[PDB]
Amino acid sequence: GLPVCGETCVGGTCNTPGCTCSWWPVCTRN
Secondary structure (H helix, E strand, O other), X not given: OOOOOOOEOOOOOOXXXXXXXXXXXXXXXX
């Protein structure tokens, strides 16, 4: 739930394993 992935999820799909798209369209870790 923390934007530290450095990436975004425009489609709600994060690349980095461990990230999740909680605050769309930005990826979040925890």
